[PDB]
Design an enzyme around this catalytic site. Structure first.
Site, PDB file in Angstrom:
ATOM      1  N   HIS A   8     -38.868   7.677 -31.777  1.00 14.25           N
ATOM      2  CA  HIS A   8     -39.778   7.258 -30.603  1.00 14.25           C
ATOM      3  C   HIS A   8     -40.971   7.873 -30.651  1.00 14.25           C
ATOM      4  O   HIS A   8     -41.503   8.490 -31.785  1.00 14.25           O
ATOM      5  CB  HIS A   8     -39.201   7.994 -29.076  1.00 14.25           C
ATOM      6  CG  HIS A   8     -39.363   9.520 -29.512  1.00 14.25           C
ATOM      7  ND1 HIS A   8     -40.211  10.188 -29.518  1.00 14.25           N
ATOM      8  CD2 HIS A   8     -38.086  10.664 -29.683  1.00 14.25           C
ATOM      9  CE1 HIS A   8     -40.001  11.627 -29.497  1.00 14.25           C
ATOM     10  NE2 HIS A   8     -38.902  11.746 -29.512  1.00 14.25           N
ATOM     11  N   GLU A  74     -31.704  13.933 -28.992  1.00 15.76           N
ATOM     12  CA  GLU A  74     -32.248  14.701 -30.007  1.00 15.76           C
ATOM     13  C   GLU A  74     -31.434  16.091 -29.876  1.00 15.76           C
ATOM     14  O   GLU A  74     -30.614  16.106 -28.844  1.00 15.76           O
ATOM     15  CB  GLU A  74     -33.814  15.129 -29.494  1.00 15.76           C
ATOM     16  CG  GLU A  74     -34.486  16.106 -30.770  1.00 15.76           C
ATOM     17  CD  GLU A  74     -34.553  16.148 -32.061  1.00 15.76           C
ATOM     18  OE1 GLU A  74     -35.348  15.359 -32.811  1.00 15.76           O
ATOM     19  OE2 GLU A  74     -33.281  16.468 -32.678  1.00 15.76           O
TER      20      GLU A  74
END
Length: 171
Positions: A8, A74
């Site tokens: 990202h 994550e």
């Protein structure tokens, strides 16, 4: 299996050097710019994305409508969420550098993180684009025997679970 993994776009904690896990930060202006540049650079394949804002927004700005999966998040840094890398205890720095033996209080261990990521990848039965995080891309690249660090808003295509195909960074 051909899989395109996208890290990202950047958030404030990237330039600030703070551990960013489940803390739901938004993209910076430059982060959104990075995401936009990805449009037209990624293949038209089914898309999946971490449900965290920064990942979802990157997917959106890149021109995709991904199905969301928390399994693509994550690692959960627990009490270390937001910790400055600089002042992280040497034992933690080493664990993260060597990518092993990391289990922060209130968080997720690296071994549990790896199991989560790889189990998710095993479930994919056809080529796809995956909007995810630096740690996820790192786990995949490291498992394929390569340095797993890639720039925010960049992508890597792999033939999972055999080899890395290409790394793509844009200016």
């Amino acid at each position: 299996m051909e899989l395109w993994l996208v890290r990202h776009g950047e958030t404030l904690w990237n330039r600030e050097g703070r551990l960013l896990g489940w803390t739901d930060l938004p993209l910076t202006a430059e982060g959104e710019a990075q995401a936009r540049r990805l449009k037209g650079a990624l293949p038209s394949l089914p898309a999946f994305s971490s449900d965290l804002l920064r990942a979802r927004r990157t997917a959106e700005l890149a021109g995709f409508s991904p199905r969301l999966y928390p399994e693509m998040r994550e690692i959960h840094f627990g009490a270390l969420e937001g910790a400055l890398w600089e002042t992280l205890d040497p034992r933690y720095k080493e664990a993260l550098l060597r990518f092993q033996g990391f289990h922060p209080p209130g968080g997720e261990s690296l071994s549990a993180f790896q199991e989560r990521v790889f189990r998710f990848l095993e479930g994919l039965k056809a080529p796809a684009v995956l909007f995810t995080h630096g740690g996820v891309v790192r786990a995949v690249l490291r498992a394929l025997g390569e340095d797993g660090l890639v720039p925010p808003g960049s992508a890597v295509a792999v033939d999972w679970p055999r080899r890395v195909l290409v790394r793509l960074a844009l200016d």
